[PDB]
Structure formats: structure tokens, C-alpha cells
Design a protein around this ligand. Structure first.
Ligand SMILES: [Ca+2]
Ligand SMILES: [Ca+2]
Ligand SMILES: [Ca+2]
Ligand SMILES: [Ca+2]
Ligand SMILES: [Ca+2]
Length: 318
């Protein structure tokens, strides 16, 4: 099943951990090594208890103190690691929508790869934290079919996996064929309804059947029929339906692909999935890119930031 790389540390003592952290920042200097080896070895819920003990003992906010002592990517990784799990995805979405400029790669990445259950959780958290409706904020900063597809997904009303109705699979496959390849132009609405509301098990069957009747994989047709933000979203949805860990592994790969590194994306995926399916993401990363995620990271990052990442990911050998 699904498996992360971070678990609750046994023999957990919040007060003790708070003191270790406190001693690592007191006086001039900062013992980063001590901080990273500790926080990456504690589950997210435990980090929250440490933060609570820290404030109780010293009357200081652990996160703000680290924001003062830490710098750069390492600081960003530590701050994201301290964000409550139930609020992280909402946090990211909020930052991708705030100020002039909307970060579409973020909206697409999260809303496409998160399950209906997760999306429901994210919407509640977002509203309680920012006193604003997530859907309304998305609509306000986006437009066209891209916006429409995101809204469909945000409803979290995807059909439930039940017995497969063969005739419905043929109907849907043929409907997609007719809405794209056999149509002068494209019927985006058809693509949105089907890909956004049908059950996961149903769609996996539709993808195979579509391949059989058209000679094309649904991804190829999408690339041939659509463009812009809509194309990226549709591909994210399809890839997620097939395998969320694969889609995420691919997102990671392209983050460390070529000159430089998309650090924000790199941190987001590793942190948000660390306690869910990061282990699976590794297996999908190896099987599809001839290398282990560990090596990719180990050879694209530097310093403490690099050390923290490797400890969270693990898998040195894969
Ligand atoms: Ca200090
Ligand atoms: Ca904006
Ligand atoms: Ca067409
Ligand atoms: Ca295209
Ligand atoms: Ca790189």
C-alpha cells in the first residue's frame, strides 16, 4: 500500500527535544546539524508537540526563532517541515494565489494529485486559516476551461469505484474519440466532465479502451488537441488517475531536470508526501528514470539543505 519515509519516533520526549533545539540556537552561532538530524527524525505531529513544549519552557516561538537563525533553502525546508500537515497544502495553494501573479504549476500539481478526501480536508483548512473560500480564490485568479476543470475537481464529487460497466467504458471512450480526434476543433467540456467525475477504476479502463479504438494514448490526444494551462492540467489528471506516485515522481524529476533546480517544488513534494507515499514515489522514480531519487538530490543540492533532504528521502541504494 501507500508508504511514507517518516514515522513517529519511538521514545519521543517533547521537552527533551525542545531543549536540544534551544541549545542549538542559543548564543552566537547555530548548530544546524543538530537541528536537521532531529526534526527529520520526528513525525510532523511530534514536531508540533516540540513546538508546544519549546514555547512552554522558554516563552519563545520555535518557528520564528529558526527563521532568525536559519537562512536560504535550508530555512525554507525547515519552515515547511514545521507547517502542520493539515495546513501545508492549503498554505501552498494560498501562496500560489497571493499577490499579482498566480502560480499555476502549483494549483495544477496539488488539485490534480489530491484525492477527493484530501481536497475536502484542504478546503476546510484553507477557509479556517485564511477566512476565504478556496474555490472563490481560484475562480478569481484563473479563467477559461482551465478554471472550469479546477472547479470540477474542487467539488470532490468523483464517482466511487464500483463494478465496471463495460458498455459505459465503451461509451466514454467513444465520446472522447468524438470530442477530440474526430472533431474539427475540440469539445473541451466533454473532456472535463468525463476526466473530472468518473471513478478512478472506470477511467483506467477507458484509457485502455480509448487506446484500442483510436491508436493513440489519451495523453497523446490531449497534447494534440489542447494547449496552455488546460493541457498541463489534463495531463496531470490523467497521470494521477494512472498513478499518483508516478505523477509526483515525474514532477520531482523535471524539478531537478537541467540547469538549476526548482527548489520550491522539490521541497513541496518531499515534505507534503513524506508521511504518505514518498516511499512509493521513490520506487516509481527508480523504475522510470534509471536512477534513485536520493542520487538525483545528492547531485543537485548542497549544504545542510542537501543533508536534510537526503535524510527525509532515504533510499540511498534503490
Ligand atoms: Ca544563535
Ligand atoms: Ca494572484
Ligand atoms: Ca480535434
Ligand atoms: Ca500541445
Ligand atoms: Ca539540476
Amino acid at each position: 500500500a501507500l508508504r511514507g519515509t517518516v514515522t513517529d519516533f519511538s521514545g519521543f520526549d517533547g521537552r527533551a527535544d525542545a531543549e536540544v533545539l534551544r541549545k542549538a540556537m542559543k548564543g552566537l552561532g547555530t548548530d544546524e546539524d543538530s537541528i536537521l538530524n532531529l526534526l527529520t527524525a520526528r513525525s510532523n505531529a511530534q514536531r508540533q508537540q516540540i513546538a508546544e513544549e519549546f514555547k512552554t519552557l522558554f516563552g519563545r516561538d520555535l518557528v520564528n526563532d529558526m527563521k532568525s537563525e536559519l537562512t536560504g533553502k535550508f530555512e525554507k525546508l525547515i519552515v515547511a517541515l514545521m507547517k502542520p500537515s493539515r495546513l501545508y497544502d492549503a498554505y501552498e495553494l494560498k501562496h500560489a494565489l497571493k499577490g499579482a501573479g498566480t502560480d499555476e504549476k502549483v494549483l495544477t500539481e496539488i488539485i490534480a494529485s489530491r484525492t477527493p478526501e484530501e481536497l475536502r480536508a484542504i478546503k476546510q483548512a484553507y477557509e479556517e486559516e485564511y477566512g476565504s473560500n478556496l474555490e472563490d480564490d481560484v475562480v478569481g485568479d484563473t479563467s477559461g476551461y482551465y478554471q472550469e476543470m479546477l472547479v470540477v475537481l474542487l467539488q470532490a464529487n468523483r464517482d466511487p469505484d464500483t463494478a465496471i460497466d463495460d458498455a459505459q467504458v465503451e461509451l466514454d471512450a467513444q465520446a472522447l474519440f468524438q470530442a477530440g480526434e474526430l472533431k474539427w476543433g475540440t469539445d473541451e467540456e466533454k473532456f472535463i466532465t468525463i476526466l473530472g467525475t468518473r471513478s478512478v477504476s472506470h477511467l483506467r479502463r477507458v484509457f485502455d479502451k480509448y487506446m484500442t479504438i483510436s491508436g493513440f494514448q489519451i495523453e497523446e490526444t490531449i497534447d494534440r488537441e489542447t494547449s496552455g494551462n488546460l493541457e498541463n492540467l489534463l495531463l496531470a489528471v490523467v497521470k494521477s488517475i494512472r498513478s499518483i506516485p508516478a505523477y509526483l515522481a515525474e514532477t520531482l524529476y523535471y524539478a531537478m531536470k537541467g540547469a538549476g533546480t526548482d527548489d520550491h517544488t522539490l521541497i513541496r513534494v518531499i515534505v507534503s508526501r513524506s508521511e504518505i507515499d514518498l516511499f512509493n514515489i521513490r520506487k516509481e522514480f527508480r523504475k522510470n528514470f534509471a536512477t534513485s531519487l536520493y542520487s538525483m538530490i545528492k547531485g543537485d543540492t548542497s549544504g545542510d539543505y542537501k543533508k536534510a533532504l537526503l535524510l527525509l528521502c532515504g533510499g540511498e541504494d534503490d
